Every structure is written in structure tokens, then in C-alpha cells.
Curated annotation (Swiss-Prot), chain A:
GO terms for biological process: mitochondrial translation. Keywords: Mitochondrion, Ribonucleoprotein, Ribosomal protein, Transit peptide. It is found in: Mitochondrion. GO terms for molecular function: RNA binding; structural constituent of ribosome. The lineage of its organism: Eukaryota, Metazoa, Chordata, Craniata, Vertebrata. One of its GO terms (cellular component) is mitochondrial large ribosomal subunit. This is Large ribosomal subunit protein mL45. Component of the mitochondrial large ribosomal subunit (mt-LSU). Within the mitochondrial ribosomes, required to direct the nascent polypeptide toward the tunnel exit and position the exit at a distance from the membrane surface. Component of the mitochondrial large ribosomal subunit (mt-LSU). Mature mammalian 55S mitochondrial ribosomes consist of a small (28S) and a large (39S) subunit. The 28S small subunit contains a 12S ribosomal RNA (12S mt-rRNA) and 30 different proteins. The 39S large subunit contains a 16S rRNA (16S mt-rRNA), a copy of mitochondrial valine transfer RNA (mt-tRNA(Val)), which plays an integral structural role, and 52 different proteins. Its main location: mitochondrion. The gene is MRPL45. Belongs to the mitochondrion-specific ribosomal protein mL45 family.
Swiss-Prot record, chain B:
PANTHER family: LARGE RIBOSOMAL SUBUNIT PROTEIN BL17M, RIBOSOMAL PROTEIN L17. This is Large ribosomal subunit protein bL17m. The lineage of its organism: Eukaryota, Metazoa, Chordata, Craniata, Vertebrata. Belongs to the bacterial ribosomal protein bL17 family. One of its GO terms (biological process) is mitochondrial translation. It comes from the Eukaryota. Component of the mitochondrial large ribosomal subunit (mt-LSU). Mature mammalian 55S mitochondrial ribosomes consist of a small (28S) and a large (39S) subunit. The 28S small subunit contains a 12S ribosomal RNA (12S mt-rRNA) and 30 different proteins. The 39S large subunit contains a 16S rRNA (16S mt-rRNA), a copy of mitochondrial valine transfer RNA (mt-tRNA(Val)), which plays an integral structural role, and 52 different proteins. The gene is MRPL17. Detected in adrenal gland, mammary gland and adipose tissue. It is found in: Mitochondrion. InterPro entries: Ribosomal_bL17, Ribosomal_bL17_sf. Its main location: mitochondrion. GO terms for molecular function: protein domain specific binding; structural constituent of ribosome. One of its GO terms (cellular component) is mitochondrial large ribosomal subunit.
Curated annotation (Swiss-Prot), chain D:
Component of the mitochondrial large ribosomal subunit (mt-LSU). Mature mammalian 55S mitochondrial ribosomes consist of a small (28S) and a large (39S) subunit. The 28S small subunit contains a 12S ribosomal RNA (12S mt-rRNA) and 30 different proteins. The 39S large subunit contains a 16S rRNA (16S mt-rRNA), a copy of mitochondrial valine transfer RNA (mt-tRNA(Val)), which plays an integral structural role, and 52 different proteins. bL32m has a zinc binding site. Zn(2+) binds at residues 32, 35, 45, 48. It is found in: Mitochondrion. Component of the mitochondrial large ribosomal subunit (mt-LSU). The mitochondrial ribosome (mitoribosome) is a large ribonucleoprotein complex responsible for the synthesis of proteins inside mitochondria. GO terms for cellular component: mitochondrial inner membrane; mitochondrial large ribosomal subunit; mitochondrial matrix; mitochondrial ribosome; mitochondrion. This is Large ribosomal subunit protein bL32m. It comes from Homo sapiens. Keywords: Mitochondrion, Ribonucleoprotein, Ribosomal protein, Transit peptide. GO terms for molecular function: RNA binding; structural constituent of ribosome.
Curated annotation (Swiss-Prot), chain E:
It is found in: Mitochondrion. This is Large ribosomal subunit protein mL39. The gene is MRPL39. It comes from Homo sapiens (Human). The modification N6-acetyllysine is found at residue 91. GO terms for cellular component: mitochondrial inner membrane; mitochondrial large ribosomal subunit; mitochondrial ribosome; mitochondrion.
Amino acid sequence: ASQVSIRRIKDYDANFKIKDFPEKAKDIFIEAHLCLNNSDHDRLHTLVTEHCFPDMTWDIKYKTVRWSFVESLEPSHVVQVRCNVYGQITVRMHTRQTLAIYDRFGRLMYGQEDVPKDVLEYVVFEKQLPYGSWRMHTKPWAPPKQPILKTVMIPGP
Amino acid sequence: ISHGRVFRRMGLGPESRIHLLRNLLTGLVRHERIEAPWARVDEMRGYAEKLIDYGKLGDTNERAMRMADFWLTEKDLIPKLFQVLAPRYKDQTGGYTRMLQIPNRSLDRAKMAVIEYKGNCLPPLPLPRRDSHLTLLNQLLQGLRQDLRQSQ
Amino acid sequence: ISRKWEKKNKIVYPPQLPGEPRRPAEIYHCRRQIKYSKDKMWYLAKLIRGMSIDQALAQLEFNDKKGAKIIKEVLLEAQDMAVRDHNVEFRSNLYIAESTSGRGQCLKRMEKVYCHYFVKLVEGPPPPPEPPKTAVAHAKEYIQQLRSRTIVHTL
Amino acid sequence: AAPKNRRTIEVNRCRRRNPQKLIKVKNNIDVCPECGHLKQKHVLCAYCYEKVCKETAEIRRQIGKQEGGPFKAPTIETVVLYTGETPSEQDQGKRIIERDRKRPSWFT
Amino acid sequence: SPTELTEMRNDLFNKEKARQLSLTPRTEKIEVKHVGKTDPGTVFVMNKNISTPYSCAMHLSEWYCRKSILALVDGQPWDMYKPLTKSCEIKFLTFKDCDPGEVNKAYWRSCAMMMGCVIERAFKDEYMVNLVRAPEVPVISGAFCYDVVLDSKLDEWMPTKENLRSFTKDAHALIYKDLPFETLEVEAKVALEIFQHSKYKVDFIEEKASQNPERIVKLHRIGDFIDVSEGPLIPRTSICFQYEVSAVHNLQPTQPSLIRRFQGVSLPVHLRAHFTIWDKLLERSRK
Ligand SMILES: [Mg+2]
Ligand SMILES: [Zn+2]
């Protein structure tokens, strides 16, 4: 498929455990989404780059998210990998999540507590090509969306 | 004590009062609608009315011509008075001007007022209408209209 | 120079249990360095002390004092922030819980006065005013006092 | 003369916060039933009046552009006509002040 | 034993209300476009079967809530507390619009329902009062009428002015209590499978929906009181400020029973009428 780009990965990394990559990806995924519920964003600094860390941390302050993982529907398999190169690797994942976000006053504003429900993801990890290690970097045709508990207004033009 | 004194006191004396009202009246005859402080407009309304009264007598009269000469400062307006305003009100025998209050002035928070000569070409002031005739109280009063008319 | 007010919009309460009453939201907001005395801003601050937001805006739009438009801009910014960030549902479901005016900093020439305006908006409808003390309440409390007399200075 | 003693915060509070010095709540505000803006009863809707003054100013700018200079008060009535409005049968012999925007709905 | 009949009604009313409210499948969303000259072109995003027009009115301003008295959705009157059902278009009708027709009709049928909830409990328990109907009359007529049938023992009792005064005081207590007019859409079978005590409204219950193609009917509830009407009602009983039941009438064909008719007249808080104009209006509430 894209072995030409993966030649750089083989040369630089010199380890390239292809089949272990899904395991590490799932581990970092669950870890990163595990520590969004404690205000302990310091490690989230090193689990995600500055490209998508500022949004993942600023739009969640004063919101008592309590995420959770319960199951992986089937094993996660790698996808096409392309590659003055930052190594971007895309992994497909069908997972089983629960999510219950709250406002800074403790009133539910999204999702239900247990409601263990399925999610489809096209996650993409990136890594400096050195000391910098694996970091989640990004996350669909038209899947449905769960509504918001709140009723809103959209003013006129 | 000021019992029964109908003339406001403004300006630097009586003369300056007449001159202030004269400038207001000239602006009114020139533009047909002016926004001025409320008390001054209320003082000038009577003068604008009587100016139209003098203007109805027509050019040929000399007393009216002298009066309109004094009370109009840019004389291009004296034609108008005798050929557009006074003819316009050949039917009305009174009440040629409408006077409203408007939002207070931004700088000095004075009580404002727009005054205009009825019937001009300008876009119409947003006059306040009364309640629609179909409202509950009006409907009950209409029923009373009918029931009283039949009895009488 | 103490920036305490704007730090009360960051207290993260614990997630509510499904049983307890829904907690009314809040928003604190402040305008700093209003070129206007404090002994004059106090009257406007007290005017809107115990009334809902919309009535407050209505009353301020038609007041003559210079600080009226400053308070109005502050309240509008507060309402917008409350809906946009603090997860308030209805932008009319707020009321002035606290309104106060405070001193300011800058220098003299004859003091050049300044002042800050502090507003706390609490979600929900206005609380009804404390009703007048009905005559039966006065008689009841007088009886209560007459019925608490003890023999003074003896066993 | 001059004060004989400072006045305490208590006396000053009983003066400054007396009801006579407070700002009264206005009992005469409402909503323009059709237009839907705030207004006092005995006063014009501020937004409506501004939108009227804008058009009056535009009309008057056209009038000035047509009369040339000062001292030109016409001796006939005037009528203002918006785009796609031929001078009606009643307005002949009256000066026309053409404008280049559709007539406002509120202009009757 | 009427004091248990009310419970026997309210329990099943709440039962149906709960079973209907529980049908909503996890808070679906609907879009309500707003039309009208004031604040036009807004798009409310509401909850399919929870949010009411009030939930939309409050979004705009306290002024809309205070002044609004009925809601048009798809250009038909729709009570303020009645939940919405689908992506719709909305507008708010007040007392001071140019054409307060629908609002006047709703106000007067609501006043009729209030007079019902006042008269029914007005008498001594040893008597038996049975509400017949709220005959729709035009606002122009001069008063709203409510047809009831008293027990046959009272043929020699034309109410005296003092008892009418008592009626008025009780109605004023009801408005002072400030209860809402809850609504409920129900399949017509409730009137045919439970409500056996419907003896004279047994006729109206087929008039509910036998005429319309659908088999659903409207129920209105003041609170520990139920009754049907033919259209939406005003949201709160506080809207009425001036209220008075003036006198009563009888219809001569006295074969079935004595169909007493009660007259009343009222106005909202907005359209208060001065003292003397109110006396004149009352004088004409006796025809
Ligand atoms: Mg002076
Ligand atoms: Zn208006």
C-alpha cells in the first residue's frame, strides 16, 4: 500500500513493531481519554501535541467530564500510513464508551451516566522523526449524533 | 409669584426671546419639521399657528406682509408662506402643527420635541395609535353601543 | 489591586446527584475603571438590586445618569457570557443577585474619581419581596416576648 | 461658618440613602405592540424615530443636491418618489425628489 | 361523596399524563422558526415533546412571556403550556394585536372554565350539581355563559345578589391562587371507559372527536378540576383581574330539568377598565 513512506519509519525507528502498534495505540487512547476527568492536564500535555491539545484542554475547563471505556468491539487494525517528516499513522477503532459531561455547577449537559454505547473512530497519531514519543494527533461519512439536554436559540441574520 | 404669566423666559431678555423663536420658526417654515428643546417648541407653536393665520390673508395685504417680513429671516421663505403653506391649509381653521416628545438629547439630557407642519412630504412621524377596535374592552363597549342604540 | 470577583466564576461544584434540587447557576462580572464617581454609581447599582435582567435593562435604557449605559453594557455582556459559557438555558431567566460599586485607582490634579461596577446574576426568577409585617405577626411576636419573661435575679 | 464636628458614616448614610434621594423605578415603560421595541408611553419609539430621521436626511440631501445653492425655497409643493414609481396623477406640477431605494413599508 | 370523585378523576388524569410523557425516546430535537414583525427570523431548537411555546417565549425576553397569551403554530391557536410536537413555525398572539380574535375567544372560554370550577364547589354537599356545558358565545355578546343543571329540589330558588357576591368572591380566590391551565391530548376512550359520572357532559364527549377524522380529544385541568373545552385556554388564571358573575337565567322548556345558566364578565390585567365603565359593562351582563 504505502510501504514507500513506511521505509522512512523502518529506517529511523529501527524497531517498527507493526502488530504491536494497535496495542500501543489503544493504550494511549484509553490513557489520554482516561485523564480528562481529573484536571490533571499536565500529562495530557505530553500525550497530545500543541496542534490539538489547546482545544482539548481549554473547551473542557470548568466542566466535570467523567468519561469511561468498557469494551473494544473488535481488534483495532492499522490503516494506510504516509510520511522534514512527522510520522502520521492512522488507526481505525470500534470502541465502547460512556460519557457524562457536567457544567461547572454539576448539572448534566450531555450524555447519560452508564449508557454503554458504540463509537467509530479514525484516530491518527503523530510522532517526531529523537526524544519525542507517540502522541495522539487527530480523530466519518455521516454517523448520528446524540442531542444536547439544552434548548438553544439561533438569532437571525 | 407668577400667576397668569403665559410667556416663558428664555434667552438674554425679551428681545433675544423673540429672536430665538424667530429662528426656530424660520427653520420650521424652511424644512417643515424641526427637533428642538421641548419648552422652546411649545413657545414657538403659537407663533407658527398665527403665522399661518397671517399668511392666509394673502400677499396683497400689507400688514401680513410686514409681519411675515419680520418673522422670516431668509426671505425666500415668504413666497412659500403665501403660496405653499397658507394655500395648503385653506380648509383647516386651526391646528396646523403637530408637536411630539422624543428621546432626550444625548449630550445635555434636555427634554426634546419634534414639531412639524401638517401635510408635508416627509416620511410620517411614528404617531401612537390607539388600541385596535377589536380588543376585549372595545368589543364589550361595542356591544354596549348596539344595546344602547336600540333602546334609544 | 485585587482581582477576586472574576475568580468566582471558576468554582467547580461536584456533579449533582439525580435527587437533589437543580442548583441555580451564577455569573459574576465586573467593569473596571469607569470614569464616574462611586457615590453616584451607587444609586444606579441599588436601583436594579432586586429585579430581573430584562426589567433592569428597561429601567436603565430610560434613565438620565451617565453610568446607566455603562451598567447596561455590563449587564448585556454578563447575559451573553452566561448563555454562551455558564450553560444557562433561557437568557431571560436571570436576575441581579448582587449589584455594587467600588472605588478606583487613578491619580489627581483635585481627585480624578474612578469606580468599578460589580454584578452577580443568579439563574431563576426574581424572589418575591419580603411582605409587610401584618398586625397578627406583631401581636404574635409581642406575645412571644411576654411569654419568655423569667423571674430576674433569683433562683 | 464651618463645621464644628465631622459627621459620622451613620448620619451620612441616613441622608444619602433616604428614599427622597433614591432613583425611582419607572412605571411607564412598555413594548411597541407592533414594532416590538421599548418605549415610554408619551414618547416616540426611539428606534422607529431614528429610522425615520435617516430617511428624512436622505430625502433632504437629494433636495439640496437639486436646489443647487441657498435661497431657493420652491413655490410649489413637493413629492418624493422611490424606484419604479411613476409620478401619480395627483402629483403633476409638484417638484419630484427621486430616490434610488425601494419605498419603505412604513412610508404610506 | 364528591370529595373522592375528584381524586378518581385526577389519578387517572395523571396516569395518562405520565404514560404519554414517558413515550418520548431520549429527548429528540425539533426546530421552531419564528415569524412576525418583532425579532423575526430566529430558529429555536427545542425538545420534541417537552418544550412548550413558553420555552420559546422565555428565550426571547420576559416581555414576550408577560404579554403573550396564546401561540399560533401552523397558523392555528395553540395554548402556551401545551407541548410542541414537530418542527413547526410559531408566532405569539397578545391582547393588543390588531386582530385579537383567537385570543379573545380563548380568554372567554378560559373564564367559562374558571366559573365552572367555582360554581361546582359552591353549594352544600347534600345537593348535586352537574355541569352541562360552556356554550361558546362571541365576545361582542356582553358576557360568557355556563350551562349547569341544579338538583330538582331548588326550583324555588332564584339566587339572591348576596349569593352571587359569594360566587364572585370565590372566583377571585381562584384567580388569586394563580394556578395554570394544564392541557392533555387523550384518546376519546377515557370518556367511554371510565367517566361514568358524565351524565350531561356524556353528550359533549362524542362532540369532542366524533366530528373530526381523528379519534383524539382535548382535556383542560385547572388543578383538582377537569373539564373539556373546544379550544386553547390562557396560560394562568392570574391573567384575569376584574371578574364578576352577574346573574343567572333559565330556559323555559323545563322537561329534562332546570338548565340554569350563569353569566359572567371579566377583563385581563392588561386591559383594566375604569370603575364606571366597569359598572356599565356589568349592567349589560344581565341579558
Ligand atoms: Mg436661561
Ligand atoms: Zn416603535
